Amino acid sequence: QQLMMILNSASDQPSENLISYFNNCTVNPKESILKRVKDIGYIFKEKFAKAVGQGEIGSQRYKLGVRLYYRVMESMLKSEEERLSIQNFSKLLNDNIFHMSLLACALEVVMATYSLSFPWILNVLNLKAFDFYKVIESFIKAEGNLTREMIKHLERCEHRIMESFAWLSDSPLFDLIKQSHTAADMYLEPVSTSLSLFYKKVYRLAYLRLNTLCERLLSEHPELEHIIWTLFQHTLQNEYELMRDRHLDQIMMCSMYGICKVKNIDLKFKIIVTAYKDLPHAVQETFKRVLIKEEEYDSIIVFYNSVFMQRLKTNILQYASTRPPTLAPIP
């Protein structure tokens, strides 16, 4: 309540202390910051109306988001003023993607509070999930009045991007992969620390879920988990194209079934799927509707046979050889 209460009384404009930060820039970003907000207001309100249909609420949502945007900006730029050279600080303030991400995240907090939720705001602003993902942790750190429920919501957004959204076709992620840590650092990157940190968090997320299912399904073969994880991590690292337009948990379940298969262990997909459902956010569509080729979808069993196996045949077989591949680090 404390945050929304502040926003209802807060200024619609940048404070003088935030303007003071603007003045310290070699290239004064203020004019472009104000115009960006005004122009985004117009697009936001229209797309809002187009969404909800006929019936002011739209204008107030944007107004509150803008107020929070300026609040968190000022808070975030206090730390960054110490951390960045004069040149980079100016570069950050004139960075469109930084501002759009900061604004999107503020709008998401207001939308979710007065609940069209994630990822609706990304399509409104034409903003890639991977670019938005860069701001979340620093946003949370810069806004001390966020409620537990909102932090959890933003963390949920972050994890949805990590598990699916960042892997959609056209995602900037694949460009970074082809090539090869505050929000400011990651937006200052040219056209990788964004890549490194993203993968580290994905690995952490992925092992957590694998651990859970393994502990419930393969206790009598406890050797299996680390082996399954090595297949999982290797595939995320080296066969990343399998993730494109698909879901982290699909590669997880296939790695389990795949490893158990080549160990001659009876673990039906049916048993795997059933345990998956008890995962805190798990949704039956993830194993029922899996992309195969050129927009045709089927169950996970078909995906495993037609795509997963055919790409990873030689890889999985090594885990049954006399020289199985070296176990992967646990994150």
Q: How far apart (Å, rounded) are the C-alpha atoms in residues 194 and 196?
A: 6
Q: Give the CA distances from residue 98 to residues 32, 91, 102, 105, in Å, rounded to whole numbers and listed in that order.
A: 13, 10, 6, 11
Helix (H) or strand (E) holding 298: strand 297-298
Q: How far apart (Å, rounded) are the C-alpha atoms in residues 129 and 136?
A: 11
Return phi, psi of residue 291, to 5°.
Answer: -65, 135
Alpha carbon dihedral 213, 209, 270, 282, in 10-degree steps, equals: 130
Q: Are 242 and 251 in contact (CB under 8 A)?
A: yes
CATH number of 1-167: 1.10.472.10
Determination technique for this entry: X-ray
CB-CB neighbours of 264 under 10 Å: 7
Give the N- to C-terminal CA distance of the chain in Å, as an integer.
37
Of 275, 273, 274, residue with least CA distance to 215: 275
Q: Are 321 and 329 in contact (CB under 8 A)?
A: no
Report domain extents, the chain.
1-167, 168-331
Of 36, 27, 138, 44, residue with least CA distance to 96: 36
Give me the sign of the Cα torsion angle 193, 194, 197, 200: negative
User: In the beta sheet, which residues pair with residue 290?
Assistant: 298
User: In the beta sheet, which residues pair with residue 298?
Assistant: 290
Q: How far apart (Å, rounded) are the C-alpha atoms in residues 146 and 139?
A: 10
Instruction: Name, in order, each residue with C-beta under 8 angstroms of 159's C-beta and a sequence gap of 6 or more.
Output: 205, 281
- Resolution of this structure in Å: 2.0
Helix (H) or strand (E) holding 286: helix 285-288
Residues for the chain: how many in total?
331
Of 143, 52, 137, 150, residue with least CA distance to 108: 150
CATH number of 168-331: 1.10.472.10
Structure tokens at 39: 């122009």
User: In the beta sheet, which residues pair with residue 291?
Assistant: 297
- What angle, rounded to 10 degrees, do the helices at 96-113 and 148-163 form? 120
Q: Give the CA distances from residue 115 to residues 68, 98, 132, in Å, rounded to whole numbers and listed in that order.
A: 17, 26, 21
